Ligand binder design. Sequence first.
Ligand SMILES: CC(C)Cn1c(=O)n(C)c(=O)c2nc[nH]c21
Ligand SMILES: CC(C)Cn1c(=O)n(C)c(=O)c2nc[nH]c21
Ligand SMILES: CC(C)Cn1c(=O)n(C)c(=O)c2nc[nH]c21
Ligand SMILES: CC(C)Cn1c(=O)n(C)c(=O)c2nc[nH]c21
Ligand SMILES: [Mg+2]
Ligand SMILES: [Mg+2]
Ligand SMILES: [Mg+2]
Ligand SMILES: [Mg+2]
Ligand SMILES: [Zn+2]
Ligand SMILES: [Zn+2]
Ligand SMILES: [Zn+2]
Ligand SMILES: [Zn+2]
Lengths: 330, 334, 334, 327
Amino acid sequence: GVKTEQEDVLAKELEDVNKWGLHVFRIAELSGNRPLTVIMHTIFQERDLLKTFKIPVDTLITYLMTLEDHYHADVAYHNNIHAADVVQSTHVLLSTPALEAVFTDLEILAAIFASAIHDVDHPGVSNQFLINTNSELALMYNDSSVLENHHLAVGFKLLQEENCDIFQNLTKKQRQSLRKMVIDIVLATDMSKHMNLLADLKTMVETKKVTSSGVLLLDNYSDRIQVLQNMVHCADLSNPTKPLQLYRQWTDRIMEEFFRQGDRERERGMEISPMCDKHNASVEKSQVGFIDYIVHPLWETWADLVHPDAQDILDTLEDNREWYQSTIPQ
Amino acid sequence: IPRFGVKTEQEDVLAKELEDVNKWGLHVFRIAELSGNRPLTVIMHTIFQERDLLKTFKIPVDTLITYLMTLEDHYHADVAYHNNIHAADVVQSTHVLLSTPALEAVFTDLEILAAIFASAIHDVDHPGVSNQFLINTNSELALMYNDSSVLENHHLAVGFKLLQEENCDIFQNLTKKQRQSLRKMVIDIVLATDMSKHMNLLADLKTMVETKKVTSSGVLLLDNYSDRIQVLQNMVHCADLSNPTKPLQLYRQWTDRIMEEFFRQGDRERERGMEISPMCDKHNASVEKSQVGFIDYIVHPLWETWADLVHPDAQDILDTLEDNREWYQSTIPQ
Amino acid sequence: IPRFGVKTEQEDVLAKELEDVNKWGLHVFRIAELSGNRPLTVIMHTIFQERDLLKTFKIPVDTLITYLMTLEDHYHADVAYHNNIHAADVVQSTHVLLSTPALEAVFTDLEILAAIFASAIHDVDHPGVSNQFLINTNSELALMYNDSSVLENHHLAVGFKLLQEENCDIFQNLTKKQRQSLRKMVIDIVLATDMSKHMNLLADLKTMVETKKVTSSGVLLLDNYSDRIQVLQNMVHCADLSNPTKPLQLYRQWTDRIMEEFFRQGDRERERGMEISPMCDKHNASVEKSQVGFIDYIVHPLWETWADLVHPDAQDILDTLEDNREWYQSTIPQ
Amino acid sequence: TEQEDVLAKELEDVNKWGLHVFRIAELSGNRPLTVIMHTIFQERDLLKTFKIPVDTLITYLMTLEDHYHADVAYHNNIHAADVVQSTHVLLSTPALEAVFTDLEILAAIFASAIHDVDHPGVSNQFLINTNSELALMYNDSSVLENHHLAVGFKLLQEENCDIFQNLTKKQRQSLRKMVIDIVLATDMSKHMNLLADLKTMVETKKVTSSGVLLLDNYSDRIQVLQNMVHCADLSNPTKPLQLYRQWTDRIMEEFFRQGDRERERGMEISPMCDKHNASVEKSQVGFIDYIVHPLWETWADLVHPDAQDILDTLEDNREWYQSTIPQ
Ligand SMILES: CC(C)Cn1c(=O)n(C)c(=O)c2nc[nH]c21
Ligand SMILES: CC(C)Cn1c(=O)n(C)c(=O)c2nc[nH]c21
Ligand SMILES: CC(C)Cn1c(=O)n(C)c(=O)c2nc[nH]c21
Ligand SMILES: CC(C)Cn1c(=O)n(C)c(=O)c2nc[nH]c21
Ligand SMILES: [Mg+2]
Ligand SMILES: [Mg+2]
Ligand SMILES: [Mg+2]
Ligand SMILES: [Mg+2]
Ligand SMILES: [Zn+2]
Ligand SMILES: [Zn+2]
Ligand SMILES: [Zn+2]
Ligand SMILES: [Zn+2]
């Protein structure tokens, strides 16, 4: 945008880039459906990643638009807006006090890049649906973390398009390390890995060693990646912790995507997946259940790790939790 | 969706619309809305039944429906022109062209099957951007197909690959001979939809019109495979370029869609600092002029030659084309 | 249609050898020669007939043979160890392990089919280099599989993909539930052959041995999918690492082959200026020492645990392993 | 070093037609493709011209050579080395002095190097008949040729393998198109049209102020490069008899293996692939009479008289096989 209105409104919104509760939907509209491109770019300047890793601006914008282009516009929930949100949320979690000066620039880059591509080329249906229809993607990945593996493959592969290699100036050592962290992070986003991820996180909280700086102590890759994996995982499962105004938009979108999968399964004569049958759904009830058995249990543990950094996030969560609970019909 | 084995009110209305399946000018857009965005599946199913293809090739009905929905699911809902509605249109248009009097009893069931299947998969998984855009961005699709008929090769590969999903092999009961023949014809047909082949296709079509030969029943005579497939390639190519030959109401809807798709590519090209492709600049475009040029240089030359081949069965179609051409002519702002 | 699945005038001598298909120590190399380098095809064919799997799963014989030939053709003839002979060996070995008294009537026909098929495809299209080599060169394969169990994921993909070639779907008559169950078990088994999972597999095998339960019949009790697939994973893993437990004559040919393959990789890593992988440096090698070490830290701890699970069915296999270990120890140049 | 001397000794003929490519294979430890490419790249100063780091070049050459099947009797790294070296000699022909740019030269050499990479040792039809994944991906059209290209370019993406990293975008785009055009033209299904176009060019042949071929447009320039590499690919019968017979034995061994596999599967056995009903000699004479001679004869015209000796050797070899045809 130039010295006009359309710009001011966008730039004014990008001002909240470092705050939980960013009006990502507003930005999506204002940026002409380029929330991932503008939010990623802003965060990259904000963290001075272009300079640090010598990323030509044009290569970065080209890769970003390409990546965003590979998110499906026709998918209600798993699209570029969700990706921008997970990225922005991770960017905020990276700045939590308890993690001050803990992670390197490269590790920061990995968490942000991973967030950016963690759902690219999502068809809007689950792994199980792809497995049951014997999709080519499922045959390729042996029914294991099919989509997650695919998100990774596409994210890296897009680096190869014209003027898209944003890591062209990283040394071989940086590339090997970045790639491994990105893979470890994205694969951890598969919900089939939630429980174990949460378990290890709790075990870590029970070993919580703070440094002379009062900041978490991570002296090995295993601990370092585990925090990064859970961070991005919390960001991916953070809709319930956002201002009700946003949380509600996310809920309607996920439900629309689920119901759409349900209709496809109904068409094909397949068994309709949980929460995907629009004729017998409990949106309000499912949200409460989602928060009770997964979101709240996860964020609570995370709050313990960075205590008291995420205290406000939890309150918002428990609050939103009540809101939906009180909307449950009778 | 029905109630106690009876059609729903919507299914009934859908059925009444499908009554014009054998007519040029079907309200394909209404069919799309009434079918819940399943124009390709219903039109294909209607056509297979009408032509008794399920029995002839022993295609179980469940398998056909499953493959149809799967094929339709792979057309992009976010692509304004090259989507399932366009596929359904090319299918129904080819279906009407196959029934032309001049081609009565000319083709076998397998050739008919091939022309129809080819029409159904001809643009599957179209990304909404041209081959050149895929080539210039060094997409993996262009790498895989060596920048040659990139999209056309991809449509074919996807069309056939989907037969491998659960209960999707509609050709499971065909012998190897039928399958190799079917496959060869379908591949020959779809690759012929690449506009870069237009001129040579048209050159060949004319050659045939020059040496055209009618049989005992005033029907076209096509010996060798070269001439039979050539006619099928041109038939599906005509169908793919039939929007301007349709009643103005339908034609204008197609024009809005292709222009919307073109402008989106232009916008992406501009964002990327790439040269903007012809007719893709929403800031510097002449929709009317382009449609006039499109008809004069490509569509009319092709259809006039086809009208000649099946003379005089395509007379009305040609008259409608010329009328739409003049209409756009008088709209060009001066 | 031939007797053993492949034409051969030495068929008589092939029959003599194949009579030992149920025996530990089959002359797989001799069978490879007599069958015309078709060890995997004839041995698999023989086992399927013997176990009556063609009848049970309604597998047409021509389809089974076509798939087997296709699968075998996809093992590299230029790879000294991870080839069709190793595949045939693992299959036959798994076949014997499945027949151990302690497991009589424990596994279903579907589970048996999974273990055998998994063994057959577990190394298909192996390039003769390790996962790290594929990862360090940024190969397309490692890119696709995100550096995780690259080869193993590939073996599975190819194994299932080949079912799509002409007349190769040996599972065409299985119900959808049988296919999904089979598919899941096969994947679970092949992914477990990744040596990076050896320790965790063994640790679990030991825990099972500690909590070992038997039925009224003196047969292993396996209550849940978890314990079932675990025994099958370790079973195939044992067969894959069974060379040191075979008659010295056979064991030595396997050692010569794996060493040749390792050195082959070492020369490639040397040319490329890469760090040479362990045991892959022909200039600094201790073949004998390495075998003894392999037995002491990997092979014996695994087989001792397996022997305890099916005690005393594998006592002779364990005794041979120890006889062979001593042999290599006595050949270490001092 | 003892053999390093023999290698360098043999490599002195890299500019000569009839190089003992088989000996180079042995002396180099089966690295003919890599060594010959390296020599030619230095010989033509290509590393400097395009700023190709030596380490990157050799890594890619080894990687490309590794993707040639060592189990395949004919379409392997030895055949690729041979086609590259032959293309190298043809490019140096007097009638073409200073005609082609270093990018066009690079294109022809590169294309020759990758033109058969990852060849399975069976024909396109075999792949099509078995519904192989490759045929499904390429819609039964130039299946293998398309694949050779795809692999050739994909391998540039491996660790330190991008030999074109320092070419401008303009050069990369131009090179890619030329390489694709050249390799796709090695598909025998394109033979007749290529020849027809080469003959036409010979009819309307024009030369510059220096007497070298006058190639005015891309269409004409690429057509000459396509046919050059095509001639290099079909140059076995033009080499001295001793090498030629070694190649015939290799191709027949590959064909027979395919025939054995087709018979095992109950498939129709492809022409010349039935070891129980073969006519090696007859096939070579027919191959020369209907394809190799018509092609080389027209090329000889185009570069007259540069290829006279090559054509004479070809005709002699043909007479030789003729005399071995039974009955
Ligand atoms: C994996 C899935 C069960 C987790 N899950 C869920 O249950 N509901 C209801 C959601 O809305 C949702 N959004 C993301 N993940 C979600
Ligand atoms: C550019 C290509 C899609 C061909 N083409 C075209 O040029 N114009 C103007 C159209 O309206 C059109 N509609 C379909 N194809 C079209
Ligand atoms: C680590 C192991 C799986 C690979 N490995 C090995 O190291 N040695 C020494 C062998 O003899 C051997 N035989 C098969 N695999 C082997
Ligand atoms: C027909 C052709 C494509 C295959 N073909 C052949 O038939 N003969 C006799 C050869 O010597 C030969 N050399 C390469 N290709 C060959
Ligand atoms: Mg996800
Ligand atoms: Mg098209
Ligand atoms: Mg293995
Ligand atoms: Mg070739
Ligand atoms: Zn997500
Ligand atoms: Zn179309
Ligand atoms: Zn193995
Ligand atoms: Zn060749």
